[model samples]
Target: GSDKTLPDQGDNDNWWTGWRQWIPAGIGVTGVVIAVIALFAIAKFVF
Candidate 1:
Protein backbone atom coordinates (compact mmCIF):
# COMPACT_ATOMS: atom_id res chain seq x y z
CA GLY A 1 0.00 0.00 0.00
CA SER A 2 2.67 2.46 1.04
CA ASP A 3 4.55 1.53 -2.08
CA LYS A 4 1.99 3.49 -4.04
CA THR A 5 2.67 6.89 -2.49
CA LEU A 6 5.36 8.83 -4.26
CA PRO A 7 8.00 10.51 -2.23
CA ASP A 8 7.67 14.21 -1.44
CA GLN A 9 9.56 16.80 -3.47
CA GLY A 10 11.96 17.48 -0.63
CA ASP A 11 13.24 13.98 -0.05
CA ASN A 12 14.28 12.94 -3.56
CA ASP A 13 14.07 16.42 -5.16
CA ASN A 14 13.43 15.05 -8.64
CA TRP A 15 9.72 15.68 -8.08
CA TRP A 16 8.94 15.08 -11.72
CA THR A 17 6.39 12.44 -10.75
CA GLY A 18 8.50 9.40 -11.52
CA TRP A 19 6.73 7.07 -9.13
CA ARG A 20 3.34 8.53 -9.96
CA GLN A 21 3.57 7.36 -13.52
CA TRP A 22 3.32 3.73 -12.46
CA ILE A 23 -0.27 4.05 -11.24
CA PRO A 24 -2.11 4.96 -14.41
CA ALA A 25 0.11 2.87 -16.63
CA GLY A 26 -0.04 -0.04 -14.27
CA ILE A 27 -3.84 0.17 -14.05
CA GLY A 28 -4.25 0.64 -17.76
CA VAL A 29 -1.98 -2.23 -18.65
CA THR A 30 -3.46 -4.45 -16.01
CA GLY A 31 -6.97 -3.68 -17.21
CA VAL A 32 -6.01 -4.39 -20.79
CA VAL A 33 -4.37 -7.68 -19.82
CA ILE A 34 -7.39 -8.73 -17.77
CA ALA A 35 -9.73 -7.79 -20.56
CA VAL A 36 -7.75 -9.86 -23.00
CA ILE A 37 -7.76 -12.80 -20.63
CA ALA A 38 -11.46 -12.46 -20.05
CA LEU A 39 -12.13 -12.36 -23.76
CA PHE A 40 -10.17 -15.55 -24.25
CA ALA A 41 -11.99 -17.18 -21.37
CA ILE A 42 -15.35 -16.17 -22.73
CA ALA A 43 -14.52 -17.42 -26.21
CA LYS A 44 -13.25 -20.68 -24.84
CA PHE A 45 -16.26 -21.15 -22.62
CA VAL A 46 -19.13 -19.98 -24.84
CA PHE A 47 -17.95 -19.65 -28.42
Candidate 2:
Protein backbone atom coordinates (compact mmCIF):
# COMPACT_ATOMS: atom_id res chain seq x y z
CA GLY A 1 0.00 0.00 0.00
CA SER A 2 1.21 3.52 -0.80
CA ASP A 3 0.03 4.81 2.57
CA LYS A 4 2.19 2.49 4.65
CA THR A 5 5.01 4.07 6.67
CA LEU A 6 8.39 2.36 6.56
CA PRO A 7 10.08 1.05 9.72
CA ASP A 8 13.01 2.88 11.33
CA GLN A 9 16.16 1.17 10.17
CA GLY A 10 19.31 1.36 12.33
CA ASP A 11 21.63 1.88 9.37
CA ASN A 12 19.71 4.91 8.17
CA ASP A 13 19.50 6.35 11.71
CA ASN A 14 23.23 6.14 12.37
CA TRP A 15 24.24 7.68 9.05
CA TRP A 16 21.86 10.59 9.59
CA THR A 17 22.99 11.44 13.16
CA GLY A 18 26.74 11.19 12.49
CA TRP A 19 29.04 13.82 11.01
CA ARG A 20 27.16 16.97 12.17
CA GLN A 21 30.16 18.96 13.42
CA TRP A 22 32.82 18.76 10.70
CA ILE A 23 31.09 21.24 8.36
CA PRO A 24 30.90 24.12 10.86
CA ALA A 25 34.38 23.33 12.24
CA GLY A 26 35.86 23.32 8.78
CA ILE A 27 34.26 26.68 7.93
CA GLY A 28 35.56 28.26 11.18
CA VAL A 29 39.10 27.00 10.55
CA THR A 30 39.00 28.27 6.98
CA GLY A 31 37.87 31.72 8.14
CA VAL A 32 40.70 31.93 10.67
CA VAL A 33 43.24 30.96 8.01
CA ILE A 34 41.99 33.70 5.67
CA ALA A 35 42.05 36.29 8.47
CA VAL A 36 45.66 35.42 9.30
CA ILE A 37 46.67 35.70 5.66
CA ALA A 38 44.97 39.08 5.28
CA LEU A 39 46.65 40.37 8.42
CA PHE A 40 50.06 39.45 7.03
CA ALA A 41 49.27 41.10 3.70
CA ILE A 42 48.14 44.35 5.34
CA ALA A 43 51.18 44.39 7.61
CA LYS A 44 53.47 44.00 4.64
CA PHE A 45 51.83 46.71 2.52
CA VAL A 46 50.45 49.19 5.06
CA PHE A 47 53.31 49.25 7.56
Candidate 3:
Protein backbone atom coordinates (compact mmCIF):
# COMPACT_ATOMS: atom_id res chain seq x y z
CA GLY A 1 0.00 0.00 0.00
CA SER A 2 2.99 2.30 0.08
CA ASP A 3 2.61 3.26 -3.58
CA LYS A 4 -1.19 3.38 -3.71
CA THR A 5 -2.81 6.16 -5.72
CA LEU A 6 -5.21 8.51 -3.93
CA PRO A 7 -8.85 8.61 -4.96
CA ASP A 8 -10.08 11.53 -7.08
CA GLN A 9 -11.39 14.69 -5.42
CA GLY A 10 -15.00 13.88 -6.29
CA ASP A 11 -14.86 10.20 -5.36
CA ASN A 12 -15.93 10.49 -1.70
CA ASP A 13 -16.92 14.17 -1.30
CA ASN A 14 -19.95 15.51 0.46
CA TRP A 15 -21.54 18.49 -1.27
CA TRP A 16 -18.40 20.65 -1.44
CA THR A 17 -20.29 23.20 -3.51
CA GLY A 18 -22.20 24.15 -0.38
CA TRP A 19 -19.02 25.53 1.18
CA ARG A 20 -18.22 27.67 -1.88
CA GLN A 21 -21.44 29.64 -1.96
CA TRP A 22 -21.71 33.42 -1.89
CA ILE A 23 -24.65 35.46 -0.67
CA PRO A 24 -27.16 36.51 -3.33
CA ALA A 25 -27.33 39.96 -1.74
CA GLY A 26 -23.53 40.36 -1.85
CA ILE A 27 -22.71 38.97 -5.27
CA GLY A 28 -21.28 41.28 -7.98
CA VAL A 29 -20.63 44.01 -5.40
CA THR A 30 -17.02 44.36 -6.47
CA GLY A 31 -18.17 45.00 -10.03
CA VAL A 32 -20.56 47.65 -8.73
CA VAL A 33 -17.78 49.38 -6.78
CA ILE A 34 -15.53 49.40 -9.84
CA ALA A 35 -18.29 50.74 -12.06
CA VAL A 36 -19.10 53.53 -9.59
CA ILE A 37 -15.45 54.60 -9.47
CA ALA A 38 -15.21 54.57 -13.26
CA LEU A 39 -18.43 56.56 -13.64
CA PHE A 40 -17.20 59.28 -11.26
CA ALA A 41 -13.86 59.51 -13.03
CA ILE A 42 -15.48 59.78 -16.46
CA ALA A 43 -17.96 62.41 -15.31
CA LYS A 44 -15.16 64.48 -13.85
CA PHE A 45 -13.27 64.29 -17.15
CA VAL A 46 -16.35 65.17 -19.26
CA PHE A 47 -17.51 68.10 -17.12
C-alpha lDDT score of every prediction, in listed order: 0.57, 0.51, 0.47
Which sequence of candidate numbers ranks them by TM-score, best first? 1, 2, 3
Question: Comparing candidate 1 with candidate 3, which one achieves the higher TM-score?
Answer: 1
Clashing pairs in 3: none
Please give each candidate's TM-score: 0.30, 0.29, 0.28
By summed lDDT, the worst window of 10 consecutive residues in model 1 runs over 13-22
> Tens digit of lDDT per residue, candidate 2, span 1-47?
12223425343433334343235664334555666777898889999
Candidate 3 or 1, higher lDDT: 1
Tens digits of lDDT, candidate 1, 1-47: 23336544556533344454345665334655676787898989998
Per TM-score, the best of the predicted structures is 1
Cα RMSDs, all models: 8.5, 11.2, 9.7
| Model 1 misplaced stretches (Cα beyond 4 Å) | 1-29
Q: What shift in Å separates residue 11 of candidate 2 from its native position after superposition? A: 27
* Residue pairs whose backbone atoms clash in candidate 2: none
